[PDB]
C-alpha cells in the first residue's frame, strides 16, 4: 500500500500536471511530445527540483501504463561503463519495441557519475541511432559531462521551486492528510527549504509526528523550529543585536544561553547571521570583505569539528572587528 | 500454497539451467493447472517462459495460487544438491517471504532443505506469442547447438533465412564468412532426426549470437527444438517437456 | 503520439562538400581532393559541432560513389577499437581485394580517434604503412595531442576552427528558407550568441525554439535557453564593486538553481581564459578560486564560500 | 639534424617546458608567452613532473635576488600543489585543471632574460624514495 | 637415514593432496615404526597429522630417525611424476639438506629423481588428541564431502549438532539457511555405507566452512571418515590408511574462530 | 587452383592443432604433388613444416600451384566444424583473396562453408633439413610427451644427451633436478613401442622447454616420433602421416636460445 511509503515517495508526481514550479520547461516538453518533435533532453538542476519525476511522468504520458517495459532507465546504482554502453545501450537503440510500435526512450538518470570513456562512446550512439530512440540525461553538475555530449542534447534548467508552487504542493499535502498549518508556520517552512520539496515533505511528516495529538490542533512555528532544530528569527536577531551593541561578556552569555536553551547549532546561527547581514547597507566594502572571509573560515573549521565555545567566541570577535571598521 | 514434488530433482535443475546466465530475476507462479515462470533480460531482447503441467510432477497440490520472484543466481547456487536422482519438493505458503526446496533420498537418510529469500517483482507476465508465424521449423537440438556454435565464432550476428525447402544460417565478420544450409527431410529410421519446415512466407532475420548461445542450452531438455519466425515479432525457440515446455522469445536485430 | 520526426541537425546534415559552411580553405582542399582523387591519410581536429564528421563523410561518399558500402570501413568510439580489432578486422579490410577506379582508394574512417588505446594506435602504424596504396585512413578527433606523433607523421593535419558569425547566420537563414519559419533579426542574433561557434548547438536551439514557441524571437530564445553561462560569471568577476558582484551571484546564478560546483568551475575557466587584467592578478584570482574549489570539494559548498572567494578576489584587485 | 617532423607532430619534452618556464623573451608580450606556456603545460598532462623539474632547477637559476623571498612565496604554492596532488587520489579529478597553474608561478617569479642556457636535470626523488 | 619405498607413488600423492593448500610447511619424521608428519596452518586452527606404519611400504629401513621440514607447495609440484603406478622411494641421510624422491617404472627404463631443498623447522610435534570425545561418528566420506559442499554455499560457518541418534549439519547466511540431517543406520547390504554414532554427551560446535572444505579431501584416502567432537578441544576428522591414518584437528569457532 | 578433399575433416584439424599456439602465420602452397606449409615463430627458433602428398586426399586436383598465407588463429577458430567425420574440401582460385573450407555430411543435409580472409606473406620457404644428423632416434610419441611433461616442471631448459646406446633427458632448476634415461630396444610383441637409436656421434643439446611442449602435440598424428639431432643445425622432430609428415625444427639454446 502507498500508506507505508514516506511522504517524499508517496507524493511522487505521476502525471505532468502534478509537477509544480517548472512551467516554461513543462509546457515546452508537452508541446514537443504532442507535435512529435522530441529532441534529446538534458535536465540540469539541483537535487529535489523534480527532474526524475518529470521524466517519469513524461514517459508515462508517452507510452502509457506499460512505461516500465518500453523505456531503458539507467542510473548510478547500475553499472554504467563503456562495455555496458556498447552492449546494452546499442542493442536497445538498434532494436525495436517488444510491446508496441514507436520510438524508444533511454533515461540516463544521474549521468554525471559516468566515465569519460562511456560518454565518448555514447556521444556517437546518440548521433547514429536518432530516428528510432531518444536520450534523456539528468544532471546536477554540468561540469562532469563532456562538451561533445553536452552539445548533442537540448538543455533544460530546472529552477528552484518558487513560493507559489511550493505553497500549492503544501496545500495539496494538507488536503491529502488530516493536518492544519499556520500561515507564519508555512512561511517559516518555505524559508528553510531553498526550493527543495524533499526537505519540505520530510519535515512536514516529522512535525505531524511531533504533534502528539489526534491532529485536532494546528502546526505553529514552534513545532517546525523545535522539530527541524532551526533557530528562530527572534533569537537570531537577538544574538546579532547583543553582538553588535552589547558588551563582550554579555554577548558571550547571550550566545551561550541562546544556543543552549533550544540546543541550536553554531553553523545554523552562522548561516542565519550571514543571511541577515546581507541586507545591511554598509560602508566601505572592507568590513564586508573581513566579515565574509572570517565567517567562511569559521564555517570551514566547524565543518571539521573543534571547540564550539572557541568557534562561537571567534564568530563574535570576527563580527565585532569587521564592524569596528564602520565608523 | 505451493507444493510441487518432482520425481527427479534433475528435471528442475535442467530447466533452471535454461534461465541461467541470460536472466537475473525470475517470476514463478504456481496455480491449479501447474507452474509457469517468466524472466526477461535487462536489455529486454529475451524472454524465457516456462510451463510445467500438473502431470509433470509426482505430487502437486494447489488450492491457492502463489506468485514468487527470485534471483536466478541464488536459485542455481542451490540447485546442485539434487543428486539428480534425489526427489525435489518446492514448498511455499500463500504469502511467502521464502521458497523452500526440499531434497530427499528414497530412504529417510539424508534430507537437504533450503529456504531461499524471495524478491518482490511487479507481476506483469507478457503474452507475446503469435497465432501464426511466417515460418516454422524443428530439427534436433544438438544439431541447432552445433549450427549456433559454428557461426558464433565468426560474428556477433547470425542470420536465419528461410525460402521454400531451404533453411540457411549465416555469419559474416572479420575473419570471413560462414553458412550452414539444411534441407527438410523425413528419416523413418528414426524421425527424431528429421528436419521439418513449414513456410508461409520467406523470412530473413538477424539475431545476436550471444543470445542464440544462451538459448541452445534447452537441448538438455528436449531432443528437438522448434523455431518459429516472423517479421512482425520476436522469434520463438521452443523445447518441449513431458507436460510443458521451455520457450525463448528473442527480438530480431534492427 | 506514435512516431517522431528527424531533427534538423540530422535531416539537414550536409551530404555534399559545398553545403559545408565551415573553414573554406580545408573545404576547398577536400573538394579538390575528391575531384582529383588520391586521398591521403588525414587527421581532422577541432571542437565539437563544427563539421568534422560530416566533412569526412561527404569526402568519402563523393570519392567512392556507389562503392561506399564495400569500400568504407566506419569505426566509432561506440565500437571496440582495441589492439585485437586493429590486428584482425582493420588488417583484413586493408588486405581485402576490391576493384576500384584508378583514382580511388579504400577509406577507413575512425571517429573519435582521441579515445583509441596506445597499443591500437601503435599497431595501426605499420597497418597503414604496408597498405598505403589500396587503403587510406581518416581520423576525426577533438584533441590532436591524444594521437601519438608516429601516427601524425604519416598523415596530413587539418585543424578546424570556430565558425564565424556570418557562416552560422547564413546556414540558419538557409534552414529557415527551407523550413518556412517566422523569425526576427534579434532572435537570430540571440541564437548565434548562445551558440558560441557551435553549428550543431545552434541548429538544435533553433529547432527547439521553433517547436516550443513557433516564432524565433530573442525573448523566446532567452526564456527557453538561459544566457551563455560563462558570460554572467565573467560579468560577476569583472564587477568593480562588491555589492554588484554579490547581487549578480545571488540573482543570476544562485536564485536560478546553478550549483556551486558549476559556478566555481565555470569561474576557474573564465579566469584562466581572461585577458582584461594582468597575469599576476589573474594568478591570484585563480588561487582564491582554487582554494574555494578545494573547500567545495570537501562538502562545504555554500553561498558563503563563494562570497568569501569574491571578497578575496576584490581584495586582491584592491591593490 | 632531424626535428621538422617532431615540430609537426610531437609535443614539448617536459624538460624543454621547464627550461622555457625560466626564460623570458624580451621581444614578445608577457601575456602571450604566459598563454603559450599554459597551453604547453596543459597539453603535456604531466604537471607533476614539470613542477618537480622546476623544483630541482630553481636554486641554480639566475633570478634578481633581494632577500630570497621569491623562494618563500613558491614554498606556499608547492605546498598547495602537494595538497592538491594528495586530494587527486581521494576525489574525482576535477582539481586537475588547477595543477597547470603552479608551474606558471615559476615563470612569473623566476623567469629572467639571463637564463639563456639549458640546465640539464635528473630524478633525485626516485633515488631518495 | 630415510629409506621408504611406496608400492604405488599414488598413495603418497593422495596423502600430500591432503596437506595441500591448507598448510605451507610440513615437518616429517621417519623412525623405526614408520613415518609421521605434522603441519599447522598460519592461523593455528588446523593441524594435519599423518602416520604411516612400516607395513604400508614395500620396503622400509630405518636405523636412525631423521626429521625434515619442507614447503608443501614445492613437494606437490614434484608430486605429479608418480604415474600413480610408478614406484616411489623417499631417501635422505641422517643430517639432510635435501630429500630425494625417486620414481621408477618396473623396467629399468625411466627413472625420475628429485632432490628437494629442505627448510629448518623447530621440531615441536603437538599431541592434542583426547582420550574421550563427547561424541564420535563415522559415515562415508563422499557423503561428508557432499554435506560440506552443500552448506558451504550458504555461509562461512557450518554448525554440527549431535543429540541422541541425530546428527545435524546447519548453515545460515545471507541467501537463507540450510540443514542436512542424518540418522545412524547399519546397512548389511554393505556396511561401508552405514552411519555410526556414539554419543556420551550432546554436542553443538561451529566450524569455518573454508576449513571443512580443506578437510574433505581425505575422501580420496578412505571410504569412511571418523569425526570426533568435544566441547573441550579441537574436533578430529580421521581418514584411515592401510597401516596408518591422516588426521585433521580443527578448532571450533569461539563465535569467530574457524 | 586449390581443390583438396580430406576424407575426414579430423586429419586436417589435428595437423593445424600442431601449428596452433606456437606460430601465428602459416604459408600454404598447393601443387601437383601435394600441399606443403611452413610457419616460423616470431623469435625464429621454431619452424613448423608440413607435407601432404596427393594420396592422403580423397580427391585432389591441381593444374596450377597456389600459395596462400593466413593467420593460424583464424584458421583454428574455424577448424572445429569438421565433426571429425565430416568431409573437408579446401578450395581456392589461382589469385585468391580467400580460402574456402567446405564441410559436408555424407547426405546432402548440412553444409558448413567458410570463406577465410588471406594474408600476404613474402614467399620464402626454408630448406634447412640436413643430409646427416649426429644422432637419430624414434620412440612412441606418447612416451616423448611424458618425458617432456615430466622435466618441463623443473626448468625452462631440457637437455638431450646421446651416447652409445643411451638417450638421456635432463632438467635442472630451482626445486632440484630430474632425468629420464631410456635405452634402445626392439619389442616384437609390437614394434610400435620399440626405441631405436642410431648414433654417429654423441650429441648433447639444450632446448627451451616451452618449445618442446609445443612440439609434443604431434603425438595426435603419429604413434612414433623421430628426433634428429646435430651440433650443426636445428633439431628435427618428425611425425609421419599417411603420405606426408609434420616436422618441427628447433634451434638448440646457445646458452640462452630456445
Ligand atoms: N516540482 C515538483 N512538484 C511536486 N513534487 C515535487 C517536485 N519536485 C520534487 N518533488 C517531490 O520530491 C520528490 C523527489 O523528486 P525527484 O525528481 O526525485 O528530485 P530530482 O529533481 O530528480 O533531484 P535528484 O533526484 O536529487 S538529481 C518527488 O517524488 C516529489 O515528491
Ligand atoms: N559547416 C557546417 N555546415 C552545415 N551544418 C553543419 C556544419 N558543421 C556542423 N553542422 C551541423 O552539425 C551536425 C553535426 O556536425 P558534426 O560534424 O557531427 O560535428 P563535429 O564537428 O564532428 O564535432 P563532434 O562530432 O562533436 S567531435 C551536422 O549534421 C550538421 O547538421
Ligand atoms: Mg533523480
Ligand atoms: Mg562526430
Q: What are the residue boundaries of the structural domains of chain B, listed by start? A: 1-254
Q: Is B179 on the interface with F (CB under 8 A)?
A: yes
Scanning every residue of chain F, which has its alpha carbon at the shortest distance from the alpha carbon of C131? Answer: F120
* DSSP secondary structure string for all residues of F8-56: SHHHHHHHHHHHTTT-SEEEEEEETTEEEEEEE-TTSSEEEEEEEEGGG
For residue A148, which atom of ligand 2 is closest to its CA?
26
The set of chains that have 3 or more CB pairs under 8 A with E is B, F
Q: How far apart are CA A138 and CA A51, in angstroms?
A: 7
Q: Quick one: CA dihedral F210, F211, F212, F213, positive or negative?
A: positive
Residue located nearest, by CA, to atom 31 of ligand 2? C9
β-pairing, B224-229 vs B235-241, is: antiparallel
Please check whether residue F183 touches E, CB under 8 A.
yes
Q: Cβ of C38 under 8 Å from any chain F Cβ?
A: no
- Strand ranges (DSSP E) for C14-125? 42-45, 72-75, 106-111
Q: How many CA atoms lie within 13 A of C216 on its CB side?
A: 26
How far is the centre of ligand 4, averaged over its atoms, from the C-alpha of C112 (Å)?
A: 7
By C-alpha distance, which of B225, B230, B171, B223 is closest to B199? B230
Output the CATH code of domain E1-258.
Answer: 3.70.10.10
Please say whether the beta carbons of F150 and E83 come within 8 A.
no
F76 interfacial to chain B (CB closer than 8 Å):
no
From residue F83, alpha-carbon distances to B85, B111, B181, F107 in Å are 32, 43, 15, 14
> In sequence order, what E strands does C123-266 have?
135-140, 156-159, 182-183, 215-216
Q: What DSSP element (H or E) covers B71?
A: strand B66-71
Task: Tell the residue nearest (CA) to atom 19 of ligand 2.
Answer: C49
Q: Cell for E96?
A: 639432510
Rounded to whole angstroms, the Cα distance separating E256 from E206 reads 9
For E190, other C-beta atoms within 10 Å of its C-beta total 7
What are B227's strand-pairing partners? B137, B237
Task: Identify the bridge partners of residue F68 per DSSP, sorted by sequence position.
Answer: F28
Where is chain D discontinuous (C–N over 2.5 Å), named by the preceding residue?
none
Residue F236 has a CB neighbour count (10 Å cut-off) of 21
Query: Which among C274, C273, C275, C282 has a CA at the least distance from the CA of C316?
Result: C282
> Are B16 and B75 contacting, i.e. CB atoms less than 8 angstroms apart?
yes
CB contact under 8 A, F74 and B175: yes
Length of chain F: 258
Give the DSSP H or E segment for B160.
Answer: strand B157-163
The bound ligand whose nearest atom lies closest to the alpha carbon of A140 is 1
Q: How far apart are CA A122 and CA A165, in angstroms?
A: 36
Q: How far apart are CA B77 and CA B80, in angstroms?
A: 7
Provide CB contacts within 8 A for B19, sequence distance 6+.
B26, B37, B39, B48, B50, B72
* CA torsion angle B224 B229 B234 B240 (round to 10): -20
Q: Which residues from B are below 8 Å from C92, CB to CB?
A: 174-175
**What angle do helix axes C260-272 and C229-237 make, rounded to 10 degrees?**
70
Per the CB < 8 Å rule, is B78 touching E153? yes
Q: Are C93 and C146 in contact (CB under 8 A)?
A: no
Q: Are F235 and F188 in contact (CB under 8 A)?
A: no
Q: Do E180 and E169 touch, CB atoms closer than 8 A?
A: yes
Number of Cα atoms under 13 Å in the Cβ half of residue C178: 10
B174 Cα to chain C: minimum distance (Å): 5
Task: Give me the half-sphere count of Cα atoms (radius 13 Å) on the Cβ side of residue E29.
Answer: 16
Q: How far is the CA of C264 from the centre of ligand 4 (A)?
A: 29
Q: Which long-range contacts (CB under 8 A, 24 or more apart) does A238-245 make?
A: A239/A269, A239/A273, A240/A273, A240/A276, A240/A277, A243/A316, A243/A319, A243/A320, A244/A319, A244/A320, A244/A323
> Going by CATH, does the domain composed of B1-254 fall within 3.40.50.1950?
no
For ligand 1, atom 9: residue with the closest CA: A50
Identify which of B43, B4, B38 has the alpha carbon closest to the alpha carbon of residue B19: B38
Q: Whose CA is nearest to atom 7 of ligand 1?
A: A50
Q: Which residues from F are below 8 Å from E81, CB to CB?
A: 150, 153, 178
Phi-psi region of A170 (alpha: psi -120 to 50; beta: other; left: phi over 0): alpha
Q: What is the largest CA-CA distance in chain C?
A: 74
Q: What distance in Å separates the CA atoms of residue F247 and residue F236, rounded to the nearest whole number?
A: 7
Binding site listing of C for ATP: 9, 21, 46-54, 142, 200
Single out the residue of F70, F77, F66, F68 nearest to residue F23, CA to CA: F70
* CA B23 to mean position of chain CA atoms: 11
- Taking the Cβ of residue C126 and every Cβ of chain F, the question of whether any pair is shorter than 8 Å is answered with no
d(CA E34, CA E54): 5
Instruction: Give the mutation candidate from F70, F117, F118, F121 for the C interface (greatest C CB count, under 10 A).
Output: F117
Q: Looking at chain F, which runs of residues are DSSP E strands?
A: 2-6, 25-31, 34-40, 46-53, 59-60, 66-71, 87-92, 98-104, 111-117, 135-140, 157-163, 166-172, 177-182, 196-199, 203-208, 224-229, 235-241, 244-250
Residues C84, C90, C96: CA angle, nearest 5 degrees:
135
Provide the 10 A C-beta neighbour count for residue B100: 17
Q: Measured from the CB, is residue A43 less than 6 Å from ligand 1? A: no
> Which ligand 1 atom sits closest to the C-alpha of A169?
4
Q: Pocket around ligand 2: residues whose beta carbon is below 6 Å from it?
A: A 148; C 9, 12-14, 20-22, 48-54, 142, 171, 199-200, 203
Cα separation, F75 vs F21, in Å, equals 12
* Atom 29 of ligand 1, nearest CA residue: A12
Parallel, antiparallel or unpaired: strands A133-139 and A104-108: parallel
Closest residue CA from atom 11 of ligand 1: A197
Mutate to test the interface with C, among B174, B175, B177, B210 (most CBs of C within 10 A): B174
First vs last C-alpha separation in chain D = 38
C-alpha–C-alpha distance, residues E131 and D53, integer Å: 74
Neighbours of B201 (CB within 10 A): 12
Q: What pairs with residue B171 in β-bridges?
A: B178
- Residue from A94, A64, C2, A99 nearest B249 by CA: A99
Using a 10 angstrom Cβ sphere, with 0-12 exposed, 13-18 middle and 19 or more buried, the burial of residue F62 is middle
Resolution in units of Å: 3.5
Q: Tell me the CA distances in angstroms from A34 to A39, A58, A97, one per residue in order.
A: 13, 11, 20
How many angstroms separate the CA atoms of C35 and E235, rounded?
A: 88
Collect all residues with Cβ–Cβ distance below 8 Å to E33 and sequence separation of at least 6.
E53, E54
Q: Please list every residue in chain C whose beta carbon sits closer than 8 Å to the beta carbon of residue A297.
A: 308
Nearest atom, ligand 2, residue C21 CA: 1
Q: Is A102 left (phi over 0), alpha (psi -120 to 50) or beta?
A: left
- Residue C307 burial (C-beta neighbours within 10 Å; 0-12, 13-18, 19+): buried
Please state, in angstroms and rounded to a whole number, the distance separating the CA atoms of residues D30 and B115: 76
Count of CA atoms in the C-beta half-sphere (13 A) of C210: 21
Q: Please state, in angstroms and rounded to a whole number, the distance separating the CA atoms of residues F107 and B209.
A: 27
Chains with 3+ CB–CB pairs under 8 A to B are A, C, E, F
Among A273, A275, A285, residue whose Cα is nearest residue C250: A275
Tell me the C-alpha to C-alpha distance, in Å, between residue C121 and each of B144, E167, F137, F180. Answer: 40, 65, 49, 49
Of F146, F175, F180, the CB nearest to E74: F175
Amino acid at each position: 500500500s502507498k500508506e507505508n511509503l514516506p511522504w517524499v515517495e508517496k507524493y511522487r508526481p505521476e502525471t505532468l500536471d502534478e509537477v509544480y514550479g517548472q512551467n516554461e520547461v513543462i509546457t515546452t516538453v508537452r508541446k514537443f511530445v504532442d507535435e512529435g518533435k522530441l529532441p534529446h533532453l538534458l535536465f540540469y538542476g539541483p537535487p529535489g527540483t523534480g527532474k526524475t519525476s518529470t521524466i517519469v511522468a513524461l514517459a508515462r504520458e508517452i507510452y502509457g501504463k506499460n512505461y516500465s517495459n518500453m523505456v531503458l532507465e539507467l542510473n548510478a546504482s547500475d553499472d554504467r561503463g563503456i562495455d555496458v554502453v556498447r552492449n546494452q545501450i546499442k542493442d536497445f537503440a538498434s532494436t525495436r519495441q517488444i510491446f508496441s510500435k514507436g520510438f524508444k526512450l533511454i533515461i540516463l538518470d544521474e549521468a554525471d557519475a559516468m566515465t569519460n570513456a562511456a560518454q565518448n562512446a555514447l556521444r556517437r550512439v546518440i548521433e547514429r541511432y536518432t530516428k528510432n530512440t531518444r536520450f534523456c540525461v539528468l544532471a546536477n553538475y554540468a561540469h562532469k559531462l563532456t562538451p561533445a555530449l553536452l552539445s548533442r542534447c537540448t538543455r533544460f534548467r530546472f529552477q528552484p521551486l518558487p513560493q507559489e508552487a511550493i505553497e500549492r504542493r503544501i496545500a495539496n499535502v494538507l488536503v491529502h492528510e488530516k493536518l492544519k498549518l499556520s500561515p507564519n508556520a508555512e512561511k517559516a517552512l518555505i524559508e528553510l527549504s531553498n526550493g527543495d520539496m524533499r526537505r519540505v515533505l520530510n519535515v512536514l511528516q516529522s512535525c505531524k509526528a511531533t504533534l502528539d495529538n489526534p491532529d485536532e490542533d494546528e502546526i505553529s512555528d514552534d513545532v517546525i523550529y523545535e522539530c527541524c532544530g532551526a533557530p528562530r528569527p527572534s533569537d537570531l536577531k537577538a544574538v546579532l543585536k547583543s553582538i553588535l551593541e552589547d558588551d563582550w561578556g554579555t554577548a558571550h552569555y547571550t550566545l551561550n544561553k541562546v544556543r543552549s536553551a533550544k540546543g541550536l547549532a553554531l553553523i545554523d546561527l552562522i548561516e542565519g547571521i550571514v543571511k541577515i547581514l546581507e541586507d545591511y547597507e554598509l560602508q566601505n566594502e572592507e568590513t564586508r570583505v573581513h566579515l565574509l572571509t572570517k565567517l567562511a573560515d569559521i564555517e570551514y573549521s566547524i565543518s571539521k569539528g573543534g571547540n564550539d565555545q572557541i568557534q562561537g567566541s571567534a564568530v563574535i570577535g570576527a563580527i565585532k572587528a569587521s564592524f569596528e571598521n564602520e565608523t | 500454497m505451493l507444493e510441487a514434488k518432482f520425481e527427479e530433482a534433475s528435471l528442475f535443475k535442467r530447466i533452471i539451467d535454461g534461465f541461467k546466465d541470460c536472466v537475473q530475476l525470475v517470476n514463478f507462479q504456481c496455480k491449479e493447472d501447474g507452474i509457469i515462470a517468466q524472466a526477461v533480460d535487462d536489455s529486454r531482447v529475451l524472454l524465457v517462459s516456462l510451463e510445467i503441467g500438473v502431470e509433470a510432477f509426482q505430487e502437486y497440490r494447489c488450492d491457492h495460487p502463489v506468485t514468487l520472484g527470485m534471483d536466478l543466481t541464488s536459485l542455481s547456487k542451490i540447485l546442485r544438491c539434487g543428486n539428480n536422482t534425489d526427489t525435489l519438493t518446492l514448498i511455499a505458503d500463500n504469502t511467502p517471504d521464502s521458497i523452500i526446496l526440499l531434497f530427499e533420498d528414497t530412504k529417510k537418510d539424508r534430507i537437504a532443505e533450503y529456504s531461499l529469500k524471495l524478491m518482490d517483482i511487479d507481476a506483469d507476465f507478457l503474452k507475446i506469442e503469435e497465432l501464426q508465424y511466417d515460418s516454422t521449423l524443428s530439427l534436433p537440438s544438438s544439431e541447432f547447438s552445433k549450427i549456433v556454435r559454428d557461426l558464433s565464432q565468426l560474428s556477433d550476428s547470425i542470420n536465419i533465412m528461410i525460402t521454400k525447402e531451404t533453411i540457411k544460417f549465416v555469419a559474416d565478420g572479420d575473419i570471413g564468412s560462414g553458412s550452414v544450409i539444411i534441407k527438410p527431410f523425413v528419416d523413418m529410421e528414426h524421425p527424431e532426426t528429421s528436419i521439418k519446415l513449414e513456410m508461409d512466407q520467406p523470412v530473413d532475420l538477424t539475431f545476436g549470437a550471444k543470445y542464440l548461445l544462451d538459448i541452445i542450452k534447452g537441448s538438455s531438455l528436449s531432443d528437438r527444438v522448434g523455431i518459429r519466425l516472423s517479421s512482425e515479432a520476436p522469434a520463438l525457440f521452443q523445447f518441449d517437456l513431458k507436460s510443458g515446455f521451455l520457450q525463448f522469445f528473442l527480438a530480431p536485430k534492427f | 503520439t506514435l512516431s517522431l520526426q528527424l531533427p534538423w541537425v540530422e535531416k539537414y546534415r550536409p551530404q555534399v562538400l559545398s553545403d559545408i559552411v565551415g573553414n573554406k580553405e580545408t573545404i576547398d582542399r577536400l573538394q579538390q581532393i575528391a575531384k582529383d582523387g588520391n586521398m591521403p591519410h588525414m587527421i581532422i581536429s577541432g571542437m565539437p559541432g563544427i563539421g568534422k564528421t560530416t566533412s569526412v563523410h561527404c569526402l568519402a561518399h563523393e570519392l567512392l560513389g556507389r562503392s561506399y558500402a564495400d569500400g568504407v570501413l566506419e569505426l566509432n568510439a561506440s565500437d571496440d577499437r582495441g589492439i585485437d580489432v586493429v590486428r584482425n578486422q582493420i588488417k583484413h579490410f586493408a588486405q581485402k581485394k576490391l576493384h576500384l577506379p584508378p583514382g580511388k582508394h579504400k577509406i577507413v574512417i575512425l571517429d573519435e580517434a582521441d579515445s583509441m588505446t596506445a597499443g591500437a594506435q601503435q599497431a595501426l602504424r605499420r597497418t597503414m604503412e604496408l597498405y598505403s596504396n589500396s587503403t587510406r585512413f581518416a581520423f576525426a578527433c577533438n584533441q590532436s595531442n591524444k594521437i601519438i606523433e608516429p601516427l601524425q607523421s604519416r598523415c596530413a593535419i587539418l585543424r578546424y576552427s570556430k565558425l564565424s558569425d556570418e557562416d552560422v547566420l547564413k546556414r540558419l537563414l538557409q534552414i529557415i528558407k527551407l523550413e518556412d519559419v517566422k523569425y526576427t533579426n534579434d532572435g537570430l542574433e540571440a541564437i548565434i550568441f548562445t551558440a558560441e561557434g557551435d553549428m550543431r548547438q545552434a541548429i538544435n536551439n533553433l529547432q527547439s525554439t521553433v517547436a516550443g514557441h513557433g516564432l524565433v524571437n530573442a525573448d523566446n530564445v532567452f526564456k527557453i535557453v538561459d544566457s551563455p553561462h560563462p558570460l554572467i560569471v565573467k560579468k560577476m568577476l569583472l564587477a568593480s564593486n562588491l555589492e554588484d558582484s554579490i547581487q549578480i551571484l545571488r540573482t543570476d546564478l544562485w536564485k536560478k538553481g546553478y550549483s556551486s560546483i558549476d559556478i566555481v568551475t565555470t569561474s576557474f575557466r573564465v579566469t584562466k581564459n581572461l585577458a582584461q587584467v594582468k597575469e599576476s592578478v589573474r594568478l591570484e584570482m585563480i588561487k582564491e578560486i582554487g582554494l574555494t574549489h578545494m573547500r567545495i570539494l570537501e562538502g562545504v559548498g555554500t553561498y558563503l564560500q563563494l562570497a568569501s572567494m569574491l571578497a578575496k578576489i576584490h581584495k586582491l584587485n584592491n591593490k | 639534424n632531424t626535428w621538422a617532423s617532431s615540430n609537426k607532430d610531437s609535443p614539448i619534452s617536459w624538460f624543454k617546458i621547464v627550461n622555457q618556464l625560466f626564460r623570458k623573451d624580451p621581444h614578445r608580450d608577457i601575456k602571450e608567452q604566459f598563454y603559450e606556456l599554459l597551453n604547453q603545460v596543459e597539453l603535456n598532462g604531466n604537471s607533476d613532473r614539470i613542477l618537480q623539474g622546476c623544483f630541482n632547477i630553481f636554486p641554480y637559476v639566475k633570478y634578481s635576488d633581494n632577500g630570497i623571498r621569491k623562494p618563500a612565496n613558491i614554498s606556499d604554492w608547492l605546498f598547495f600543489h602537494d595538497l592538491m596532488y594528495q586530494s587527486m587520489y581521494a576525489h574525482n579529478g576535477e582539481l586537475l585543471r588547477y595543477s597547470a597553474l603552479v608551474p606558471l608561478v615559476f615563470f612569473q617569479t623566476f623567469g629572467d632574460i639571463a637564463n639563456k642556457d639549458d640546465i640539464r636535470m635528473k630524478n633525485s626523488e626516485y633515488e631518495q624514495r
